[PDB]
Design an enzyme around this catalytic site. Structure first.
Site, short mmCIF file in Angstrom:
data_model
loop_
_atom_site.label_atom_id
_atom_site.label_comp_id
_atom_site.label_asym_id
_atom_site.label_seq_id
_atom_site.Cartn_x
_atom_site.Cartn_y
_atom_site.Cartn_z
N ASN A 1 0.85 -1.17 0.00
CA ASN A 1 0.00 0.00 0.00
C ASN A 1 0.89 1.22 0.00
O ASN A 1 1.41 1.64 1.05
CB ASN A 1 -0.90 -0.03 1.25
N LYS B 1 0.00 4.17 -0.35
CA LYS B 1 -0.73 5.30 0.23
C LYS B 1 -0.53 6.50 -0.67
O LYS B 1 -0.50 6.36 -1.90
CB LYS B 1 -0.37 5.57 1.71
N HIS C 1 -9.79 0.69 4.67
CA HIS C 1 -8.53 1.05 5.36
C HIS C 1 -8.83 2.03 6.47
O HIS C 1 -9.65 2.93 6.32
CB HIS C 1 -7.56 1.66 4.33
N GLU D 1 -7.41 4.55 7.50
CA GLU D 1 -7.28 5.97 7.20
C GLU D 1 -8.53 6.53 6.54
O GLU D 1 -8.83 7.73 6.73
CB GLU D 1 -6.04 6.21 6.31
N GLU E 1 -6.00 -4.67 11.03
CA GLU E 1 -5.20 -3.49 11.36
C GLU E 1 -5.28 -3.28 12.86
O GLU E 1 -6.34 -2.92 13.39
CB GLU E 1 -5.73 -2.29 10.60
N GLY F 1 0.40 4.32 16.01
CA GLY F 1 0.68 5.60 16.57
C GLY F 1 0.34 5.69 18.04
O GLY F 1 0.35 6.78 18.62
N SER G 1 2.42 -2.72 11.56
CA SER G 1 3.72 -2.32 11.03
C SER G 1 4.53 -3.53 10.62
O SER G 1 4.83 -4.36 11.46
CB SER G 1 4.46 -1.65 12.17
N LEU H 1 -0.45 -6.42 4.50
CA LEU H 1 -0.65 -5.19 3.74
C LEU H 1 0.36 -4.23 4.32
O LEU H 1 0.27 -3.82 5.48
CB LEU H 1 -2.07 -4.69 3.93
N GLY I 1 2.80 -0.86 4.60
CA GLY I 1 2.82 0.56 4.36
C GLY I 1 4.20 1.07 3.98
O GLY I 1 4.69 0.81 2.87
N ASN I 2 4.81 1.90 4.84
CA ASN I 2 6.03 2.62 4.49
C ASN I 2 7.11 1.70 3.96
O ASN I 2 7.89 2.11 3.07
CB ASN I 2 6.57 3.29 5.76
O1 LIG Z 1 4.52 0.25 8.65
P1 LIG Z 1 3.89 1.57 8.73
O2 LIG Z 1 4.59 2.56 9.60
O3 LIG Z 1 3.77 2.36 7.32
#
Ligand SMILES: O=[P-]([O-])[O-]
Ligand SMILES: O=C(O)[C@H](CO)OP(=O)(O)O
Lengths: 246, 246
Positions: free
Chosen positions: B8, B10, B93, B95, B163, B169, B209, B228, B230-231
């Site tokens: 993803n 994003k 998602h 978000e 998720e 966070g 994460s 899935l 992310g960063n």
């Molecule tokens: O793994 P998440 O911080 O994008």
């Protein structure tokens, strides 16, 4: 003022329908230094549409994010639009305010993000049937315009759109005269807020039901500078709407 | 179950950064008949991304409309996605639930449209820190899954994502075993709402994460069928996360 005719394709198209429609549009000889003609395809159709349209046509997307780049799944930032040279964005369309609860503050933040990234913005507003029948059209539009108008630092790069929601899907009809009065008052707000030259420069489009029959009656009004066209812009005869501005 | 590793991206990328990243991804030899690897770029980056990735990589988009074709400015319908041969959609998602107030009913409607149009769907859910601290994990996930789960007919074509919002966070950290415990509970909910065979087929991904240092410990868990990501999926070393599932 330079007239401005925009095709909001909304959520419509296939690869093949866009191939035939863009081919038909390309057959119209117009001078893009004399009028702006902008096509707004669905995001995933942008590259196909921009490739198929000749360079005289401008292009844009139908929404942009209020957030910049980062963890905003499903959004398109103004920075990504800039990197792709997507020239225009629509902001504040009634369908986003209605179905996606977009607010005046969201419109302001999207305009701010757009201008910071050298995107030109087509910013929409307009009052509902109940507001109009309550004689609130000017109170409503004033608040909507004042949500964002102080951000405009170049009056060629922001284009306003009046959407007469009282006359969309209500079985009500706006006339050229009714639209002209609202446009005069919109331009009066810009005047009030931003100054006379700026007001006389900015384009104010009509965003109600535009088709090949009524387009000239609208654009010939003194304060109507073009249109944001919905369903008629999915037809090859959209070229006759562009011709009303030529 | 076939493992499933998804990127993803994003709201991130430039055309240049995607050219570099897709090239690095193409260098990885893997067999797509054994493992699904899916890339989800921003909508206006889809065409570039799909042309740059070899077909061993599947592709999708990060959101889809709850409405079909028509007057929904800014939305992408499942019908339009299907005509572009977009294979996958992400729905629900966190978000979009957070910033765009997407509800369980929106998720259901997007899933129904997606499956109607023969798209495959990656459907996300999960509980907040307050919900976990109130010992309501199973209640919350049961309700979120039951909002949509009856629409699934082919349990290869809908992929669930947990998720752990309580660890996103919040300064809190999900261990692979804590993830595994929720994945086993999700699979039980599918077993009792749909059926045993259905539950043993469906892929359940971890959507907390994921990085090169934890991916192996996660995918080894019995009820974790991929991620899935992310960063970490914006980095060339995403290929080592893919390798952990090979
Ligand atoms: O793994 P998440 O911080 O994008
Ligand atoms: O102009 C928009 O983009 C609209 C909203 O109604 O479409 P139509 O021209 O068919 O009324």
């Amino acid at each position: 003022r330079k007239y401005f005719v925009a095709a909001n394709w909304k959520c419509n198209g296939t690869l093949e329908s866009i191939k035939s429609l863009t081919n038909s549009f390309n057959n119209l000889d117009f001078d893009p230094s004399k009028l702006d003609v902008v096509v707004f395809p669905v995001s995933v159709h942008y590259d196909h549409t921009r490739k198929l349209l000749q360079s005289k046509f401008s292009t844009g997307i139908q929404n942009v994010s209020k957030f910049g780049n980062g963890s905003y799944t499903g959004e398109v930032s103004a920075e990504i639009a800039k990197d792709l040279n997507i020239e225009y964005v629509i902001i504040g369309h009634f369908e986003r305010r209605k179905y996606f609860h977009e607010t005046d503050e969201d419109v302001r933040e999207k305009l701010q993000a757009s201008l910071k990234n050298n995107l030109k913005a087509v910013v929409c507003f307009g009052e509902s049937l109940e507001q109009r029948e309550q004689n609130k059209t000017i109170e409503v539009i004033t608040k909507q315009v004042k949500a964002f108008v102080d951000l405009i630092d170049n009056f060629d790069n922001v284009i306003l759109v009046y959407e007469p929601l009282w006359a969309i899907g209500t079985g009500k009809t706006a006339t050229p005269e009714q639209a002209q009065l609202v446009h005069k008052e919109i331009r009066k707000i810009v005047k009030d807020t931003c100054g006379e030259k700026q007001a006389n420069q900015i384009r104010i489009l009509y965003g109600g039901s535009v088709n090949t029959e009524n387009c000239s009656s609208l654009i010939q009004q003194e304060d109507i500078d073009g249109f944001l066209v919905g369903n008629a812009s999915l037809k090859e005869s959209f070229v006759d709407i562009i011709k009303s501005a030529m």
